[PDB]
Design a protein around this ligand. Sequence first.
Ligand SMILES: CCCCCCCC/C=C\CCCCCCCC(=O)O[C@@H](COC(=O)CCCCCCCCCCCCCCC)COP(=O)([O-])OCC[N+](C)(C)C
Length: 289
Amino acid sequence: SYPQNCPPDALPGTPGNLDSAQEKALAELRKLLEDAGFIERLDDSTLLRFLRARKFDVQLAKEMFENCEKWRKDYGTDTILQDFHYDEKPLIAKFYPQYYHKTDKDGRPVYFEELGAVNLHEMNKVTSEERMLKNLVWEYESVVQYRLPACSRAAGHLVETSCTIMDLKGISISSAYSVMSYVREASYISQNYYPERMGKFYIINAPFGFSTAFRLFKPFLDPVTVSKIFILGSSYQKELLKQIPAENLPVKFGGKSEVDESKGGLYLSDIGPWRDPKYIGPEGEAPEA
Ligand SMILES: CCCCCCCC/C=C\CCCCCCCC(=O)O[C@@H](COC(=O)CCCCCCCCCCCCCCC)COP(=O)([O-])OCC[N+](C)(C)C
């Protein structure tokens, strides 16, 4: 168990903040699904996320959920946490940092990626696209099962979304052509299978003409997705501190938070309430390496 209701000042159609019509829509969809033979992921949070993804259209949300359930069983997502071994992670992480550090003002996990060293040919030597997306699915289920529950216990309310920061420092804009396929697949996964899991998505240190580049990706992205994405130049600090306390924001990004050499520095640690024994529960500590 952990807090299951969003704060009351959150949007409607989120748990704890339903009107009678949203209520009836949730009970209807739940009954449809129970009739279909489903069992897992009939909790308020999940179903309201699919409803919200379809503006509370019951038949459309049901179709969404059913396709997602189908893909979970086709991809083997339900055991992926125990059946995927991303052994090449220490290699890829040196091109492509992907880490967490603490929480935002609403309790969301803060997730970071740095793209300035990503080189496609090198990682092509290290891995395949299919495995990188297996790892993406793996990190989604991991944040769901470990990070979000602890985050919810720490905030005192439900937390179901991430605060993501993606640093473009040092990318070459001409590189974007090379990753559309990957982005198309990643976004396809995030939108159809993890709906309503984005919270805020900053893009910092963006180089000039990047707003032009991002156009190549826009035909992949839901409008709800694009409304979450906030593109910034090198003046990102004030904006980040609006959303994350300085104590929780790494020093390289304008805040005051630090990680020691001992603990693996910023990249290799995984500091946050999902590491705190006060806030870990029946799910245990997140896998860590
Ligand atoms: C060799 C093998 C294959 C090769 C693959 C190589 C590709 C690798 C390289 C780079 C990958 C870059 C894109 C990755 C997409 C990340 C999105 C994501 O996580 O999903 C988000 C959906 O959000 C979207 O759908 C929006 C994505 C658009 C922004 C990306 C364009 C910037 C690229 C600039 C171009 C620079 C080019 C660089 C060159 C100097 C969800 O966000 P969230 O909920 O906050 O996150 C969930 C948290 N979790 C995931 C931890 C669970």
